[PDB]
Design an enzyme around this catalytic site. Structure first.
Site, PDB file in Angstrom:
ATOM      1  N   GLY A  29       1.119  -1.078   0.068  1.00 13.78           N
ATOM      2  CA  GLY A  29      -0.332  -0.395  -0.003  1.00 13.78           C
ATOM      3  C   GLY A  29       0.552   1.128  -0.165  1.00 13.78           C
ATOM      4  O   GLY A  29       1.981   1.313  -0.279  1.00 13.78           O
ATOM      5  N   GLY A  31       1.699   3.825   2.180  1.00 15.07           N
ATOM      6  CA  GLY A  31       2.099   4.858   4.248  1.00 15.07           C
ATOM      7  C   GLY A  31       1.237   3.274   4.790  1.00 15.07           C
ATOM      8  O   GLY A  31       0.069   3.634   5.349  1.00 15.07           O
ATOM      9  N   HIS A  47      11.112  -3.699  -0.720  1.00 11.83           N
ATOM     10  CA  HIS A  47      11.022  -2.551  -1.804  1.00 11.83           C
ATOM     11  C   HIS A  47      11.780  -1.174  -1.347  1.00 11.83           C
ATOM     12  O   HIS A  47      11.508   0.320  -1.412  1.00 11.83           O
ATOM     13  CB  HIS A  47      10.409  -2.458  -2.960  1.00 11.83           C
ATOM     14  CG  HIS A  47      10.109  -1.218  -3.889  1.00 11.83           C
ATOM     15  ND1 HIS A  47       9.451   0.070  -3.425  1.00 11.83           N
ATOM     16  CD2 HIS A  47      11.241  -1.117  -4.887  1.00 11.83           C
ATOM     17  CE1 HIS A  47       9.506   0.639  -4.676  1.00 11.83           C
ATOM     18  NE2 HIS A  47      10.883  -0.086  -5.774  1.00 11.83           N
ATOM     19  N   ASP A  89      13.761  -0.987  -8.115  1.00 11.71           N
ATOM     20  CA  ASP A  89      13.248  -1.086  -8.373  1.00 11.71           C
ATOM     21  C   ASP A  89      13.512  -1.854  -9.676  1.00 11.71           C
ATOM     22  O   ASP A  89      11.879  -2.949  -9.228  1.00 11.71           O
ATOM     23  CB  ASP A  89      12.747   0.253  -9.459  1.00 11.71           C
ATOM     24  CG  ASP A  89      11.850   1.277  -9.427  1.00 11.71           C
ATOM     25  OD1 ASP A  89      11.679   1.269  -8.254  1.00 11.71           O
ATOM     26  OD2 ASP A  89      12.593   2.509 -10.222  1.00 11.71           O
TER      27      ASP A  89
END
Length: 121
Positions: A29, A31, A47, A89
């Site tokens: 998500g 946050g 990540h 990434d």
């Protein structure tokens, strides 16, 4: 930039980032963070810590340079911060991809109170 990471994840897994991952598990998500629900959920978690390394460039809009050496992502470009970013990434796209067979539609849009305390980076 998300659009880049977005292209990356696409050609990697063959899926639309936001739609299938944007709200996945407890970490994916925006946050959100907590004990990962599974392989993919963890990916997102890691990540996040990775992005927490670039203290001189915003991973959101800053566009780095990269290519695809025959089906393989390959960063290598100007600046350093853009690189960390470009490298995080790629590690996400390959992660999410390594556990496709673990994607769980029940996590796709996971509540929140259904989570727990996030692990320390």
């Amino acid at each position: 930039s998300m659009y880049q990471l977005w292209k990356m994840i696409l050609q990697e897994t063959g899926k639309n980032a936001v739609p299938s991952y944007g709200l996945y598990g407890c970490n994916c998500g925006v946050g959100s963070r907590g004990k990962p629900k599974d392989a993919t959920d963890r990916c997102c978690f890691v990540h996040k810590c990775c992005y927490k390394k670039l203290t001189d460039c915003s991973p959101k809009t800053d566009s780095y340079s990269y290519s695809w050496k025959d089906k393989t992502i390959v960063c290598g470009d100007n600046n350093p911060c853009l690189q960390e970013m470009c490298e995080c990434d790629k590690a996400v796209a390959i992660c999410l991809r390594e556990n496709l067979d673990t994607y769980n539609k029940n996590y796709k849009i996971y509540p929140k109170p259904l989570c727990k305390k996030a692990d320390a980076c």
